[PDB]
Amino acid sequence: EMQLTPFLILLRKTLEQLQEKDTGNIFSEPVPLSEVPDYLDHIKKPMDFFTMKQNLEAYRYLNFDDFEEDFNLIVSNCLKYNAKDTIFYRAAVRLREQGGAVLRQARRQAEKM
Ligand SMILES: O=C1CNc2ccc(Br)cc2N1
Numbered sequence: 499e500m501q502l503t504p505f506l507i508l509l510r511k512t513l514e515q516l517q518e519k520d521t522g523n524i525f526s527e528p529v530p531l532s533e534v535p536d537y538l539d540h541i542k543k544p545m546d547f548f549t550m551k552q553n554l555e556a557y558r559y560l561n562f563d564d565f566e567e568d569f570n571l572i573v574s575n576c577l578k579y580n581a582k583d584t585i586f587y588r589a590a591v592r593l594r595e596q597g598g599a600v601l602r603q604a605r606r607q608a609e610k611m
Pocket residue numbers: 524525529530533534575576579580586
């Protein structure tokens with residue numbers, strides 16, 4: 499029960515803040531199937547921030563949970579694919595932690611709308 503434009507403005511700002519936590523930019527674009535050709539063998543729905551931006555502008559995120567779901571997919575795919583002792587796995591743990599705080603604050607703002 500809110501206006502669309504300010505909500506999407508909020509989601510754009512939030513997506514920017516999540517990308518800011520991915521300082522290595524390892525989640526900015528789809529996992530390169532050229533360098534990881536077996537990636538799709540158990541990752542049923544790849545996700546990344548560029549795809550999220552396209553989903554956002556295509557009006558596919560009309561509530562906070564659908565936006566947060568795809569962010570969680572970025573995290574969960576990375577934990578699933580990579581061994582625990584890798585930089586990638588620890589980066590997803592850190593993104594889960596730092597992104598979670600970004601998301602909680604953003605959701606508080608959406609709920610005021
Ligand atoms: O799981 C991942 C996350 N992103 C990524 C970027 C480049 C390369 Br190479 C591998 C990965 N794997």
